[PDB]
């Protein structure tokens, strides 16, 4: 996995098994934050 350019904006693609692991559907709002040098993303 790597950071790619979508538009003129950095973006990371999320594999299907990760969407299912978090019960995330397209457009689900998520909270992004930086914790312990890691990018954290949790569903709202």
């Amino acid at each position, epitope marked *: 996995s790597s950071v790619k350019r979508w538009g003129n904006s950095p973006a990371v693609r999320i*594999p*299907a098994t990760l969407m*299912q*692991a978090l019960n995330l559907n397209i457009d689900d709002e998520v909270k992004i934050d930086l914790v312990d040098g890691k990018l954290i993303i949790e569903p709202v």
Partner: nanobody
Amino acid sequence: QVQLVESGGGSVQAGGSLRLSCAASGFTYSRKYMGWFRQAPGKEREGVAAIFIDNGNTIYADSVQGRFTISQDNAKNTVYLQMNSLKPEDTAMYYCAASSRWMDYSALTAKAYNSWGQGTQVTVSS
């Protein structure tokens, strides 16, 4: 990535329950999710349940949702498939599977797994 051993198979009367188990060994800490697949006589293998190791979240195929439930004991590196209200159509060879990677396929599909058990037979008498 891990070796898988299923157990618990057997013959049960229709309407009954049965609990299957799957013990993983090897690089058990690499497991992202594990699932149960089954092959009924003459048919293609289908995914029935999956469980994500880190958060215990589960997903099920329409054919068994509500009747089958998958759980885990991470201490023992094992996953279980509880089957309630079994019916003759549930007769099949049940296989345990595991993935050490976050594949871009549904966890209810075979392409999402890279480790497979030998299967345990479940027969439900009409």
